């Protein structure tokens, strides 16, 4: 259904990516480098429906809900690189923040051979549907915590690509102009 397409765990902008320009490329990828300390913030991605491209066409072709928002990450580490972050990774448009976000939906990942995580964001929103408008559905934040750990090694930098999905509901509602098309 349309849903597998939006659905089948796609990859994401998410943001514009301080690019190589690898960051189109990327998209899915925040950066993973070592770090002077580990706790410092490196990201803050904003989610809509609108914005980042795969989400965009679907969102215009509809303007209601049914769904959830699953973001599952994957890693290109090495023997030699390793890595860990934690990602929020945030419903709807709260606190913008550290602990508030940790307080959020939650996943803790090891980035070793697992090569996949499920951080799923739900739309925790007063109404079942949010319509397509400009300000924001809300933020997804990532925090890279501890880098990479290592070897000799791997050129230093490691990268992740984020994955996006919704359930439960697969099904939305109200079709509207789809981003792609003719005239």
């Amino acid at each position: 259904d349309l849903v597998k397409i939006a659905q089948l765990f796609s990859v994401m902008a998410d943001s514009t990516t301080p690019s190589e320009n690898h960051g189109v490329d990327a998209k899915g990828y925040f950066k993973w480098s070592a770090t002077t300390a580990p706790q410092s913030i490196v990201h803050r991605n904003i989610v809509y429906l609108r914005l980042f491209p795969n989400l965009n066409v679907f969102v215009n072709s509809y303007s209601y809900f049914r769904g959830s928002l699953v973001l599952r990450l994957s890693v290109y580490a090495s023997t030699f690189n390793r890595g860990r972050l934690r990602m929020g990774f945030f419903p709807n448009a709260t606190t913008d923040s550290t602990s508030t976000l940790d307080n959020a939906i939650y996943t803790i990942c090891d980035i070793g051979s697992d090569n996949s995580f499920e951080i799923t964001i739900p739309y925790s929103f007063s109404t079942w549907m949010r319509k397509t408008n400009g300000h924001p559905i809300g933020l997804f934040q990532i925090e890279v915590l501890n880098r990479l750990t290592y070897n000799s090694s791997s050129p230093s930098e490691v990268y992740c690509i984020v994955q996006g999905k919704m359930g439960q509901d697969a099904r939305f509602f109200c079709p509207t102009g789809s981003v792609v098309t003719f005239q």
Partner: antibody
Amino acid sequence: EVQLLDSGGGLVQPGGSLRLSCAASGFPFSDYAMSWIRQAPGKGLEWVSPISGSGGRAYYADSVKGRFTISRDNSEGTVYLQMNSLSPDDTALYYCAKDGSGSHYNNNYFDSWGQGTLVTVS
Amino acid sequence: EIVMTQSPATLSVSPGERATLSCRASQYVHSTLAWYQQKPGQAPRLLIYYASTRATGIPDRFSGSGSGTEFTLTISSLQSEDFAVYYCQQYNNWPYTFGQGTKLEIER
């Protein structure tokens, strides 16, 4: 218009401890990062510590490490340095300063300095 | 361990002439470099940040360029009030650090 006003510095014995304060105005204080930088007689400027917004992450220079502690009061928009373990190398004129990251980069440029408080650890 | 270094420890320039201050770094710093001017007994003054953007209230005779590990502060026609010490500083990585300063003195 940024006004960074600094009090609290005075002559102190070695092994002593001072608490410097610097109060800010005319900018949204609680969004900006803030640093203390000092200036020794017969010396240039050394950044000492900076604190990040929420009073979250703070960093220090190796000289100052465990001796000095940086704390913000955002409810009164003030900045604090607690200088323990004072040695003569700490004699200086201390300035509070306000840094900004601009748009979405990683550099923090200072845009306003205060007037200077003198700490004579002798 | 990022260390900045200003070549002219003291620049003696005639009034009205131009002056050029250099500031290298021991590792790449991209464009997060800023320049400061300091008169005796006063707080420092921000002249340039982002390597090249002039701050508000800074005349056009002041200008900065360069990137990486090498920067320059050019002042077109040095005026009487441009008599001072100048410091560069980088913010590309912690801890943040300043140069040892360049003293621009009136040459006669």
